[PDB]
């Protein structure tokens, strides 16, 4: 939702990081991209693809995820 | 000629022991026993490592696999010109004579032997694997 | 000219590179005497560098944005803009020497194959026969064309071993 507003200066986020082995410096080191915790910066390009095909909000991605899960089942 | 019978009360060659002997397989699956006759006391090399002394007369030894027994047989035949023979012993006490199976060594032809696994054709006459496909299991064209 | 390149005689980077090489050589020479062995060797290297740059510019080579000569491999462009000396003439020169070597070796193998022990001649080279064949190999293209036209260059398919497929 924030990357669509400024897709030139905002890095995409893959997913959050939950690792009990991380120390404090690793926690603030991976905390970037505007998130509230340690996350991974995606390099797959799904943000640009979804933005080009029409995705704008998180609701759209949620609905698409549920639909693909039903298709998988 | 008649099939010999194993004599468990047979003296063994003078050996101090080693760590390459029998294992749990001898007590749970099977083991092998080789016996031979020596004309004199002589030092030979054990297939499991070390040097043993065969005594004058009967000699009995135990091995974990048939290859060790045949290696010792080859050593005794080629060096000391002896005639050894071995058996496969099971934990229940069953003894099965193995070599020489018919009393004559397999390198020399003997009457009464029935040929087994002989193909009356050459290798180039084997069929293609496609003709053997979809069989009961993985089968090679040479098996037919 | 070709591919947007410029001749080395007019490239500024070419002259700049020549000045840079002469500058580092002169800088190394500044620490020695004027009539010693390192001074003479450095002066000889400087003269060789100047002669090499002048000869490359005189040859008409094309230099890129880096100031280094670029070769033209297309026969049409090379023959149309005077660049046949880069890749064309050396191509035929290599073809002549390579075919020379191959023809001499083939002739030696065919000559020693009809003897009692050809393998012995293969490990212990018969110098007189090899020298005679090496001298006679000057006419390798004509001899090769004649062998190909007579059908004696190749071996029949029935005389060559193959796998059982």
């Amino acid at each position: 939702e924030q990357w669509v507003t400024d897709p030139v200066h905002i890095r995409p986020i893959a997913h959050a990081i939950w690792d009990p082995h991380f120390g404090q410096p690793a926690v603030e080191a991976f905390t970037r991209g505007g998130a509230s915790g340690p996350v991974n910066i995606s390099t797959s390009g799904v943000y640009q693809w979804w933005y080009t095909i029409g995705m704008r909000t998180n609701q759209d991605l949620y609905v698409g995820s549920v639909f693909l899960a039903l298709v998988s089942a | 000629w008649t099939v010999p019978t194993l004599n468990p009360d047979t003296p063994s060659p003078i050996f101090g022991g080693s760590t390459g002997g029998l294992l749990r397989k001898a007590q749970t699956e099977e083991f092998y026993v080789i016996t031979w006759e020596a004309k004199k006391e002589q030092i030979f090399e054990m297939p499991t490592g070390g040097a043993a002394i065969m005594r004058q007369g009967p000699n009995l030894l135990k091995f974990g696999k048939k290859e060790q027994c045949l290696a010792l047989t080859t050593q005794l035949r080629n060096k000391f010109k002896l005639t050894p023979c071995f058996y496969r012993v099971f934990p229940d006490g069953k003894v099965q004579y193995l070599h020489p199976a018919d009393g004559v060594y397999p390198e020399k032809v003997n009457a009464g032997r029935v040929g087994a696994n002989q193909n009356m054709r050459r290798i180039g006459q084997n069929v293609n694997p496609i003709k053997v496909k979809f069989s009961g299991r993985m089968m090679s064209p040479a098996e037919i | 000219d070709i591919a947007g390149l410029t001749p080395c005689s007019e490239s500024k980077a070419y002259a700049k590179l020549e000045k840079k090489e002469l500058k580092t050589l002169e800088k190394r020479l500044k620490q020695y005497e004027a009539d010693s062995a390192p001074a003479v060797a450095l002066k000889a290297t400087m003269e060789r560098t100047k002669a090499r740059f002048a000869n490359y510019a005189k040859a008409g080579l094309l230099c890129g944005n880096d100031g280094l000569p670029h070769l033209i491999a297309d026969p049409g462009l090379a023959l149309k803009y005077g660049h046949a000396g880069e890749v064309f003439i050396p191509t035929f020169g290599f073809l002549y020497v390579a075919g020379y070597i191959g023809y001499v070796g083939r002739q030696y193998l065919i000559a020693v194959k009809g003897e009692a022990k050809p393998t012995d001649k293969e490990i212990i080279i018969d110098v007189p026969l090899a020298t005679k064949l090496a001298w006679q190999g000057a006419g390798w293209p004509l001899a090769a064309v004649q062998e190909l036209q007579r059908g004696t260059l190749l071996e029949k398919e029935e005389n060559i071993t193959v796998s059982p497929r």
Binding site: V27 | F44, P47, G49, A71 | S36, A37, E122, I160, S163
Partner: protein
């Protein structure tokens, strides 16, 4: 029982007839080639003298003549080094300024632009900076002019001619008998007394009469031209008396047991010379005197032709305990009849000695202006270490060869060898467990440190600031050696080396030698070294003990020492021969020695080598070993990535050749991976297709092209792997140490 000279006259006729018949030494190769394999076999069995014939006398004669040929080659190489130092070097200029002029003894011809390799080494000379250390050795011997080096080169050529003549004379004219070679008592007596003792005594005489006065005047600031010639010093007693007052009394104090008078040139100074940075030559001269006396005494122990002396057979038979059965019975016959067993023992001790030489040479620099020449020190340590490791692997190989060919069970009924082979399973199993324990407790520390450092937890690492592993035993030993000259060495003026502790010695603004402190990183790298050495020992020992038989193949001895496998049966019996164990041991030796030289280079450049400034010493890398050697990332970044800058940007300078080799060595090593990961079946079929193309054009050779054998493929792969890796490290080390050191 009688030790005499037993020689046969004219056994082999000198002729060129066999020179035209390749493979004459082998019965199988004398028939001639039919396939290309024969050619390789011709070189793989050239020196396998025991394989050509079973006569021990013929093998011994061939070995003795081959030794003469080797000595002739060595003499030619030494003569070449002296000639290069006398005609294409700057030794004379380097003598007047050894702290600024770089040693050089190789000049290249001005062809194809290679003249750039003739760098400005100083002294008005252009050439390649050498790292062999011949300049320091020649300076230590008292050589001051090129005429002396030229004369030594001519003498070396004469000695080489004499060695080759001796080999020919002993193989074709006067060949010794088998009983002559079996005189181990006489041979040991002569080698201990004559060779070693007399060589040490002669070198002590040269040091006392040439090295000591010439080097004393050199250190005093006298020009080499003004220093008297060695014969002038050896001709009159006035000059020597002025330089050493004890020379005024002649050799009289030596015979009157007044040795204390010779304390001016025979001392126990210890430490290093503050002018040159090397060991005191008076200490080296006194050392050689003591060594000569000790070896001369040791050379009168064995019985030869009189009642006095010892019989090694009796000594070996008298050592028998209740835990080892018979003992050393049959060992005398084994070592007096098998050349492979002797080669195994000699190669093992020889390699160990070479490694000891490398350590003692860097720690106690014996040559003047050697410690400050960081390039020479690093190159010498690395070279001697590699030679030692190679000789050790060869020792394992020949031990396995003896066990396969010369072992006889009728002479080893209950000896030490018999019992070792009897419990080889227990030996190998325990060594396997200790190898796994060492690997975990050595490499896991680095992995744990890497993980903790990456996870942002430096407080949980195995470092000096965090949980530390201090080598208390090594530190205690260092303190003991440093405090030794005051309690346990009253006559020693200083310690043996400065690595134990104390003040630093600097020559020309560069630290010649300073104390070496050991911390957690040193502890970890030492355990890494122990683990790698244990794995190499495990592979070599497994290949020696299981060379004749094993639980997988009971008749391995019948298959020989060098065979590819025993088929794909029993699940697969690939690389079961002892040769393959040596093949794998070579890789492990390379790994071990590579980590050893890497540790030496980083430790020396970080805590020892460096410049001297006002109130402080600045090292080459700034002391980053204690903080970065505890992680693999530190070794990859601070040691491999940071120090490789000098070799990758060396283009356009005199060290550019090193950079070229640095790339070439990466090629050969990668080339090895083609032979090590592939099999000859694929290559044979590919050759079949190429042969088809050749038959089509009537260019098929009579000698059938065959792919390399399985053993040859493994040998080629390991040879290329070792060459590429060692050459890579050589180029990197030399370029870095010459540019920054």
């Amino acid at each position: 029982k009688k030790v005499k000279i037993a020689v046969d006259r004219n056994p082999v006729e000198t002729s060129f007839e066999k020179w035209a018949k390749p493979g004459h030494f082998s019965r199988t190769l004398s028939k001639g080639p039919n396939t290309t394999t024969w050619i390789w076999n011709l070189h793989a069995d050239a020196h396998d003298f025991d394989s050509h014939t079973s006569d021990l006398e013929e093998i011994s004669r061939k070995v003795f003549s081959a030794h003469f040929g080797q000595l002739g080659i060595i003499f030619i190489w030494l003569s070449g080094m002296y000639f290069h130092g006398a005609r294409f070097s700057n030794y004379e200029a380097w003598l007047s300024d050894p702290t600024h002029i770089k040693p050089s003894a190789q000049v290249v011809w001005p062809i194809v632009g290679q003249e750039i390799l003739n760098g400005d080494v100083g002294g008005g000379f252009q050439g390649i900076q050498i790292t062999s250390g011949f300049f320091q050795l020649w300076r230590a011997s008292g050589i001051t002019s090129e005429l002396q080096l030229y004369t030594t080169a001519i003498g070396g050529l004469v000695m080489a001619a004499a060695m080759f003549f001796a080999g020919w004379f002993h193989y074709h004219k006067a060949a010794p008998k088998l009983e002559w070679f079996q005189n181990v008592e006489s041979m040991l007596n002569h080698h201990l007394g004559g060779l070693l003792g007399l060589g040490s005594l002669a070198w002590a005489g040269h040091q006392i009469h040439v090295s000591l006065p010439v080097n004393k005047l050199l250190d005093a600031g006298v020009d080499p031209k003004e220093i008297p010639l060695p014969h002038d010093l050896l001709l009159n007693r006035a000059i020597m008396a002025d330089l050493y007052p004890s020379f005024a009394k002649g050799i009289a104090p030596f015979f009157t047991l007044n040795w204390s008078e010779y304390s001016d040139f025979l001392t126990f100074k210890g430490g290093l010379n503050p002018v040159t940075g090397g060991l005191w030559l008076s200490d080296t001269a006194h050392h050689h005197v003591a060594i000569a006396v000790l070896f001369l005494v040791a050379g009168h122990m064995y019985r030869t032709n009189w009642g006095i002396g010892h019989s090694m057979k009796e000594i070996l038979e008298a050592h028998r305990g209740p835990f080892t059965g018979e003992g050393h019975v049959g060992l005398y016959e084994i070592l007096t009849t098998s050349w492979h067993a002797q080669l195994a023992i000699n190669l093992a001790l020889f390699g160990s000695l070479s490694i000891i030489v490398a350590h003692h040479m860097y720690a106690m620099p014996p040559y003047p202006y050697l410690a400050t020449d960081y390039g020479t020190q690093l190159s010498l340590f690395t070279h001697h270490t590699w030679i030692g490791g190679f000789c050790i692997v060869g020792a394992g190989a020949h031990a396995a060869i003896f066990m396969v060919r010369d072992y006889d069970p009728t002479n080893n009924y209950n000896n030490l060898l018999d019992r070792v082979i009897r419990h080889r399973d227990a030996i190998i199993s325990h060594l396997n467990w200790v190898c796994i324990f060492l690997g975990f407790h050595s490499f896991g520390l680095y992995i744990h440190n890497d993980t903790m450092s990456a996870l942002g937890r430096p407080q949980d690492m195995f470092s000096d600031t965090a949980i530390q592993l201090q080598p208390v035993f090594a530190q205690w030993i260092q303190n003991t050696h440093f405090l030794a000259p005051q309690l346990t060495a009253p006559n020693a003026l200083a310690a043996t080396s400065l690595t134990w502790g104390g003040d630093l010695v600097a020559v020309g603004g560069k630290v010649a030698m300073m104390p070496i402190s050991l911390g957690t990183s040193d502890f970890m790298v030492h355990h890494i070294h122990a683990f790698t050495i244990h794995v190499t020992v495990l592979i070599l020992l497994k290949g020696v003990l299981f060379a004749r038989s094993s639980r997988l193949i009971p008749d391995k001895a019948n298959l020989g020492f060098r065979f590819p496998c025993d088929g794909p049966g029993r699940g697969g019996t690939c690389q079961v021969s002892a040769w393959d164990h040596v093949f794998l041991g070579l890789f492990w030796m390379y790994n071990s020695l590579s980590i050893v030289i890497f540790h030496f280079s980083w430790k020396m450049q970080s805590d020892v080598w460096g410049t001297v400034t006002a109130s402080g010493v600045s090292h080459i890398t700034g002391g980053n070993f204690a903080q970065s050697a505890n992680t693999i990332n530190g070794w990859l970044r601070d040691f491999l990535w940071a120090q490789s800058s000098q070799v990758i940007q060396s283009y356009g300078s005199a060290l550019s050749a090193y950079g070229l080799i640095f790339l070439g060595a990466h090629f050969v090593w990668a080339f090895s991976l083609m032979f090590l990961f592939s099999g000859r079946g694929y290559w044979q079929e590919l050759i079949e297709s190429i042969v088809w193309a050749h038959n089509k054009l009537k260019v098929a050779p009579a000698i059938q092209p065959r792919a390399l054998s399985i053993t040859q493929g493994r040998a080629v792969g390991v040879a290329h792997y070792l060459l590429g890796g060692i050459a890579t490290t050589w180029s990197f080390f030399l370029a870095r140490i010459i540019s920054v050191g």
